[PDB]
Design a protein around this nucleic acid. Structure first.
Lengths: 59, 126, 142, 182, 263
RNA sequence: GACGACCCAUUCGAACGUCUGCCCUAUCAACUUUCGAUGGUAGUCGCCGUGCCUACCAUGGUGACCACGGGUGACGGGGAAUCAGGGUUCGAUUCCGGAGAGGGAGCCUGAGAAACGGCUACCACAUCCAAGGAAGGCAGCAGGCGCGCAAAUUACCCACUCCCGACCCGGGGAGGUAGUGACGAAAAAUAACAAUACAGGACUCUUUCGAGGCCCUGUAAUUGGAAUGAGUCCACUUUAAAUCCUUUAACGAGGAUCCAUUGGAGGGCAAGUCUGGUCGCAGCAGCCGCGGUAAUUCCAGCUCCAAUAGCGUAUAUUAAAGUUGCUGCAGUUAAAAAGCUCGUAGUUGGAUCUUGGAGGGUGCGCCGUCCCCGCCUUGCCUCCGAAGCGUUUACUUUGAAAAAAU
């Protein structure tokens, strides 16, 4: 009732081809970042009555 | 830039031979002022002279151009030299005195304790 | 309303309540000091022990996996306890005769998930944090 | 060594409707964080609770009279509150903006001397603003009534006078060493 | 503890009415043994450097005292923590000031300058009246002064004008309905007023209904009542306020009205 | 101008004495005395009250209104945390009261000690020695071992605050002062403003096309002028002397920074109807559930969310929990009315004994509005006060007495 194996321990982590870090930008300091959020969310942000939309969408 | 030394909240205190008051120092826009400059400057408003106007406390305020402290000016240089905290007189070129720093002395005394009376014996041992 | 209503009857009401509190399991546990007396951890929140052996435990249906815990002798009271080793390949990081910091599941003493009869998890070895080890912030020191 | 907390988080944590409301407040109010809002939601709840208690008391009741009038007078000095309000029946029917409106940051906008709740906070936190003999760097301040008029740039920050700027003064000597001579 | 007399006072466990701050240190002065009970006293140090501002340090308070600058009831006192109290005089000479320790309406020893006379005499409340040894009788006042041969009228709770250089009672006042009073303890500590009634309890505890010059009425324990003269005619200085007591609203009304305009 | 004494009171106290309030437990129901348990009486003792002790003499005292016995993540309280209201839980720990200084017991001195930075024995521990001897007690301050989930300098000073002594003057690991210090709490930086440049929407004009236009946000393009301490640093302040803060000449912001994090993105639950990889494997998953080849749960990136100089995790406990239910639970069938009745304690108990205009507080501009009061049989008697003085209470009402911190 245990017997069995571990041979396979860590098989996916070790098979998952590493990815670069890439990079890019810094996102913004405290209140300024809050400000960008508020303009992007609300000012931005006009919205349509498209019956809605999304934040982390592709096509 | 001119300054201005202003002495607020005055008390004539006879029973300790001195006039004691707050020192309000405008320095408009830089900072600061020397303790020596302050005592010199006060010395000439209370008709007393430097060596009778101790000055202490002090913290420039927030942002710059002011500093509030405290001063005393003594009626007899004798009266000051005796009513005086000693550390205060030491601070300017009239008082200084012996240090230690303290545990060397305590050690000496504890060595002395071992020895019956005499103790001077323990003095020559320290 | 199952409960007198006389101005006097404070003692009956007060006491009837004392009598029924028992059935509360959290209450009874506390008054009987169970955590001190039965529990493997002292009535403390974390506990450190030595690794005896590595177990591959057989996750309960409908799930199917080999679980991967160690068996640990707690230094504090020589108690024998099996503890889960979380994340991918982390067994790796603990060896027999190891030392380890164990902690509760967050289940109130009741085993977690599919993982059967295991009530604790490893947190530190290399005195050294499986997390920091798994990431590679820090190593299997030696 | 006594101390107390100054803010309180909301029972609950994800109620789109509340989140949007808070974000609009941060934006209008050049705020920095939710705590920044939470701190005020907290300030207000205690005021309202103070108010509600009082309002349950008898009027003329030395305790209700002496403390009610005081709460009101305190609430008015800061402009937070107005007279008809300026009784307890009105504080009960009040809100957060009313406080939020009195901070520095939004005033330095509100009279040109910033043109942004933005600009305002960096101005304040950078020492170019006195409330009359005193620099005030706390974008978080709370401008009292008859103190509204004394807010202005400071005696030396450049506007406010005083040379130029550790970076402007760099630039003056930036056209000096090369283009003047060798 | 438990083998002997305490010698320290944790500050904070000191009496509020000295109004020492919270930070500063751990310990308050703690009154020496003396003529006034420790709670009910005002160590000179607090007077010299905490109320009068003559001293900064405690080191200074001492330097002052060793001069001999300061007398209590006429007779130089040289102890930092001397327990001065109600009806005490305190005289700083090379400064010309006479002060009588008598209460605020807060219940705080008040800074109360008195004339260069007056300073001569103090009013003591009789505490006990005694046949001492050899058949002589004596009275005992609050301030712990025993005077032999007093005149036979004087009875416990009466008050008594002491000379002061000489000791010597130089008259008295009976405790009777309608006498002026000073309240020396409790909720009403500092209120002055006529009398009205003494409710009497055997076994223990006699209350004194007092009425003030404003028809404001209140009670305290007989223990707390001190007789100071005849209505409208105190036998001493009263501090500004005539021990009146005003509601926190009345108090606010006076504070804003007297200034930011009214000279 | 430089301490004793007798006796009394005083002050600081002390030692005992009053009541009223304490956790869990009945798988603890009778207990306590021939080694006094309860009482008489007298003495001895003590600072003194008292079976403290002792003689003689009684046979008491306590219990279902929980005694007795036992247990204990019990020092007790002021207090703390959790907020409808009710409540619920903690309290060793900056104050108060009590207790101890390796364990036990005894004692000296002195006003005060059954003291351990006194002593003495034993008991347990440890140390020096030339082996006969001899000297010791960090639950003081640092530090060290052991223990563990867990906790700082073998640092400076008596200047502050106070204390003590023969004492202004000395002495204080009391205490202050710095160092360590994300318990935890406060303030809140790591980038603001135009311009082109554009990307855009309510407004207006026009039949439409089309154009103008205010409010501006981004997003680059770099500009362009406009900025501040974080560091660094003459000087100065702080303070016993320093440090840091709060102070500032000279320096210190074009992003590749003077470079913000930690969890989450299938449901609850805020956020990928992703791309590569794997294929019920590794892993994820408090719970429900995912993954068996188009994985929005994995493993990584990308992207996005949330809280933000903090955030995750474990755990005690609390709120949520009207899932302990006074307020405010359920029990025909869901977990739960004893088969039935008698019955002591306890709880609980019918109707009925007195009736039928102005004084004072806070609102609104001399007027009034709205409480509160004696009024349109109400303490008797003793013979206005005083006194007699209460039929008992509970209750409720008005006072005093009511530690500070909190």
């Amino acid at each position: 009732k245990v017997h069995g194996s571990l041979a396979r321990v860590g098989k996916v982590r070790g098979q998952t081809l590493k990815v670069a870090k890439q990079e890019k930008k810094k996102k913004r300091t405290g209140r300024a970042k809050r400000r960008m959020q508020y303009n992007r969310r609300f000012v931005n942000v006009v919205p349509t009555f498209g019956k809605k939309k999304g934040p982390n969408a592709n096509s | 830039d001119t300054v201005t030394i202003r002495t607020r909240k005055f008390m004539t205190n006879r029973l300790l031979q001195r006039k004691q008051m707050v020192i309000d120092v405008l320095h408009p826009g830089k900072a600061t002022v020397p303790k020596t400059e302050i005592q010199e400057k006060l010395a000439k408003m209370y008709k007393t002279t430097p060596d009778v106007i101790f000055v202490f406390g002090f913290r420039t305020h927030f942002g710059g151009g002011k500093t509030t402290g405290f001063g005393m000016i003594y009626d007899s240089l004798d009266y000051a030299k005796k009513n005086e905290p000693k550390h205060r007189l030491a601070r300017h070129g009239l008082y200084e005195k012996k240090k230690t720093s303290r545990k060397q002395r305590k050690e000496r005394k504890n060595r002395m304790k071992k020895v019956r009376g005499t103790a001077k014996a323990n003095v020559g041992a320290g | 309303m199952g409960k007198c209503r006389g101005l006097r009857t404070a003692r009956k009401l007060r006491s009837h309540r004392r009598d029924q509190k028992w059935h509360d399991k959290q209450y009874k546990k506390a008054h009987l000091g169970t955590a001190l007396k039965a529990n493997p951890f002292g009535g403390a929140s974390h506990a450190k022990g030595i690794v005896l052996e590595k177990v591959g435990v057989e996750a309960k249906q409908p799930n199917s996996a080999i679980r991967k815990c160690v068996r640990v002798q707690l230094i504090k009271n020589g108690k024998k306890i099996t503890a889960f080793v979380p994340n991918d390949g982390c067994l790796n990081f603990i060896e027999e005769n190891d030392e380890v910091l164990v902690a509760g599941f967050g289940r109130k003493g009741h085993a977690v998930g599919d993982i059967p009869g295991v009530r604790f998890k490893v947190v530190k070895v290399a005195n050294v944090s499986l997390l920091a080890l798994y990431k590679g912030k820090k190593e299997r020191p030696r | 060594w006594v101390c107390r907390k100054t803010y309180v988080t909301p029972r609950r944590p994800f109620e789109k409707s509340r989140l949007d409301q808070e974000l609009k407040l941060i934006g209008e109010y050049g705020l920095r964080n939710k705590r920044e809002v939470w701190r005020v939601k907290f300030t207000l709840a205690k005021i309202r609770k103070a108010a509600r208690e009082l309002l349950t008391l008898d009027e003329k009741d030395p305790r209700r009279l002496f403390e009610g009038n005081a709460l009101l007078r305190r609430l008015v000095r800061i402009g937070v509150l107005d007279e008809g309000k300026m009784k307890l029946d009105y504080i009960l029917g009040l809100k957060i903006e009313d406080f939020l409106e009195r901070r520095l940051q939004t005033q330095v906008f509100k009279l040109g001397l910033a043109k942004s709740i933005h600009h305002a906070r960096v101005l304040i936190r950078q020492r170019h603003i006195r409330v009359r003999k005193q620099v005030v760097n706390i974008p978080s301040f709370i401008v009292r009534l008859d103190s509204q008029k004394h807010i202005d740039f400071s005696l030396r920050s450049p506007y406010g006078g005083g040379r130029p700027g550790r970076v402007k003064r760099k630039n003056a000597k930036k056209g000096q060493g090369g283009a003047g001579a060798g | 503890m438990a083998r002997g007399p305490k010698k320290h006072l944790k500050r904070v466990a000191a009496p509020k009415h000295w109004m020492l701050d919270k930070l500063t240190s751990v310990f308050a002065p703690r009154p020496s043994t003396g003529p006034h009970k420790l709670r009910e006293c005002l160590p000179l140090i607090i007077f010299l450097r905490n109320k009068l501002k003559y001293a900064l340090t405690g080191d200074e308070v001492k330097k002052i005292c060793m001069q001999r600058f300061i007398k209590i009831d006429g007779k130089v006192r040289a102890d930092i923590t001397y327990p001065a109290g109600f009806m005490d005089v305190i005289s700083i000479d090379k400064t010309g000031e006479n002060f009588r320790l008598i209460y605020d309406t807060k219940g705080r020893f008040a800074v109360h300058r008195i004339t260069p006379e007056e300073a001569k005499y103090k009013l003591c409340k009789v505490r006990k009246i005694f046949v001492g040894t050899k058949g002589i009788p004596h009275l005992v006042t609050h301030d712990a002064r025993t005077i032999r041969y007093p005149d036979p009228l004087i009875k416990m709770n009466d008050t008594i004008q002491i000379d002061l250089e000489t000791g010597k009672i130089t008259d008295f006042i009976k405790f009777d309905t309608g006498n002026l009073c000073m309240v020396t303890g409790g909720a009403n500590l500092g209120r002055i007023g006529v009398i009205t009634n003494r409710e009497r309890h055997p076994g223990s505890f006699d209350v004194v209904h007092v009425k003030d010059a404003n028809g404001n009425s209140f009670a305290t324990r007989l223990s707390n009542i001190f007789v100071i003269g005849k209505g409208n005619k105190p036998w001493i200085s009263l501090p500004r306020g005539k021990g009146i007591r005003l509601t926190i609203a009345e108090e606010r009304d006076k504070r804003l009205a007297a200034k930011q305009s009214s000279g």
